[PDB]
Write a protein that holds these residues in place. Sequence first.
Motif, mmCIF file in Angstrom:
data_model
loop_
_atom_site.group_PDB
_atom_site.id
_atom_site.type_symbol
_atom_site.label_atom_id
_atom_site.label_comp_id
_atom_site.label_asym_id
_atom_site.label_seq_id
_atom_site.Cartn_x
_atom_site.Cartn_y
_atom_site.Cartn_z
ATOM 1 N N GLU A 35 0.860 -1.163 0.000
ATOM 2 C CA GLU A 35 0.000 0.000 0.000
ATOM 3 C C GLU A 35 0.910 1.231 0.000
ATOM 4 O O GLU A 35 2.078 1.171 0.402
ATOM 5 C CB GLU A 35 -0.849 0.006 1.271
ATOM 6 N N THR A 36 0.367 2.364 -0.457
ATOM 7 C CA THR A 36 1.073 3.633 -0.354
ATOM 8 C C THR A 36 0.046 4.688 0.001
ATOM 9 O O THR A 36 -1.148 4.484 -0.196
ATOM 10 C CB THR A 36 1.801 4.096 -1.627
ATOM 11 N N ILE A 105 10.496 5.932 -13.175
ATOM 12 C CA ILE A 105 11.085 5.229 -12.043
ATOM 13 C C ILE A 105 10.525 5.855 -10.770
ATOM 14 O O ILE A 105 10.446 7.076 -10.670
ATOM 15 C CB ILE A 105 12.620 5.372 -12.090
ATOM 16 N N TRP A 106 10.165 5.014 -9.794
ATOM 17 C CA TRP A 106 9.594 5.479 -8.534
ATOM 18 C C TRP A 106 10.211 4.660 -7.407
ATOM 19 O O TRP A 106 10.131 3.435 -7.443
ATOM 20 C CB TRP A 106 8.071 5.312 -8.604
ATOM 21 N N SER A 107 10.849 5.311 -6.420
ATOM 22 C CA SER A 107 11.370 4.579 -5.275
ATOM 23 C C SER A 107 10.219 4.210 -4.334
ATOM 24 O O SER A 107 9.396 5.044 -3.965
ATOM 25 C CB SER A 107 12.517 5.311 -4.601
ATOM 26 N N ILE A 108 10.203 2.929 -3.953
ATOM 27 C CA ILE A 108 9.118 2.335 -3.186
ATOM 28 C C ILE A 108 9.698 1.571 -2.003
ATOM 29 O O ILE A 108 10.598 0.754 -2.159
ATOM 30 C CB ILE A 108 8.285 1.390 -4.075
ATOM 31 N N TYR A 109 9.174 1.851 -0.805
ATOM 32 C CA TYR A 109 9.513 1.119 0.396
ATOM 33 C C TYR A 109 8.446 0.060 0.667
ATOM 34 O O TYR A 109 7.285 0.214 0.271
ATOM 35 C CB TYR A 109 9.599 2.042 1.612
ATOM 36 N N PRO A 110 8.814 -1.021 1.386
ATOM 37 C CA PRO A 110 7.870 -2.080 1.759
ATOM 38 C C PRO A 110 7.027 -1.644 2.956
ATOM 39 O O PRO A 110 7.132 -2.190 4.053
ATOM 40 C CB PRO A 110 8.814 -3.250 2.075
ATOM 41 N N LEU A 111 6.164 -0.646 2.750
ATOM 42 C CA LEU A 111 5.416 -0.066 3.856
ATOM 43 C C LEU A 111 4.496 -1.101 4.500
ATOM 44 O O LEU A 111 4.448 -1.195 5.726
ATOM 45 C CB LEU A 111 4.579 1.115 3.371
ATOM 46 N N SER A 112 3.758 -1.871 3.693
ATOM 47 C CA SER A 112 2.782 -2.791 4.260
ATOM 48 C C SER A 112 3.445 -3.873 5.112
ATOM 49 O O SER A 112 3.036 -4.119 6.252
ATOM 50 C CB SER A 112 1.920 -3.406 3.184
ATOM 51 N N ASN A 119 4.252 6.143 8.004
ATOM 52 C CA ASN A 119 5.539 6.760 8.309
ATOM 53 C C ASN A 119 5.882 7.844 7.282
ATOM 54 O O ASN A 119 6.337 7.552 6.176
ATOM 55 C CB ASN A 119 6.637 5.694 8.356
ATOM 56 N N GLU A 120 5.717 9.112 7.673
ATOM 57 C CA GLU A 120 5.925 10.235 6.767
ATOM 58 C C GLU A 120 7.385 10.375 6.330
ATOM 59 O O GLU A 120 7.649 10.930 5.264
ATOM 60 C CB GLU A 120 5.444 11.525 7.421
ATOM 61 N N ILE A 121 8.337 9.932 7.155
ATOM 62 C CA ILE A 121 9.740 9.983 6.772
ATOM 63 C C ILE A 121 9.974 9.070 5.566
ATOM 64 O O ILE A 121 10.624 9.461 4.595
ATOM 65 C CB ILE A 121 10.654 9.613 7.955
ATOM 66 N N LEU A 122 9.442 7.846 5.617
ATOM 67 C CA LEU A 122 9.617 6.952 4.482
ATOM 68 C C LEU A 122 8.843 7.480 3.278
ATOM 69 O O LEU A 122 9.324 7.380 2.155
ATOM 70 C CB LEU A 122 9.177 5.537 4.852
ATOM 71 N N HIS A 123 7.654 8.051 3.489
ATOM 72 C CA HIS A 123 6.938 8.603 2.349
ATOM 73 C C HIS A 123 7.802 9.617 1.604
ATOM 74 O O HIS A 123 7.790 9.654 0.381
ATOM 75 C CB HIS A 123 5.670 9.332 2.792
ATOM 76 N N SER A 124 8.548 10.435 2.362
ATOM 77 C CA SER A 124 9.341 11.517 1.790
ATOM 78 C C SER A 124 10.498 11.002 0.932
ATOM 79 O O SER A 124 11.089 11.781 0.183
ATOM 80 C CB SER A 124 9.868 12.443 2.870
#
Length: 138
Positions: A35-36, A105-112, A119-124
């Motif tokens: 999810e994002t 290209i889009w940087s994506i973290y494993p948020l779910s 986490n707004e820091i990772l969103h940034s």
Amino acid sequence: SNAQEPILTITHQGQTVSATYQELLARSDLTIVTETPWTQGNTEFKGISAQALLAWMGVKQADLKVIALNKYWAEIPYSDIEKYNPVFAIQNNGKPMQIRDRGPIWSIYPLSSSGELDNEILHSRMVWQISSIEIITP
Ligand SMILES: Nc1nc2ncc([C@H](O)[C@H](O)CO)nc2c(=O)[nH]1
């Protein structure tokens, strides 16, 4: 455009290298399902992981300075690379991303899977429309 047009520049030790979609896909080691804050439900994002990109460049420990087409930028610290290994996604549900759809290209973290959806820091650090990545060594 096409799969063989350059879409990314990586700078390491004062040298610049260019990469195409075709090239990045050949080096795509990671799919993150997450999810994002800007999408509905789970999306499958495939591309080259931060760890894989550093390995390609011949680095183990470094930060990444990521710049987008619209000039937004964010630095992905090594600690995030180790703990989350975010992906430089070139596919969204298996297909390329148009510039108008946050590509190429889009940087994506494993948020779910990491419990970090809020986490707004990772969103940034989830930079869409990436155009360049600079490897920052200690
Ligand atoms: N290219 C680009 N990528 C982005 N990625 C994430 C966010 C989020 O809103 C951050 O939380 C903002 O810091 N904003 C942007 C942005 O504006 N531009």
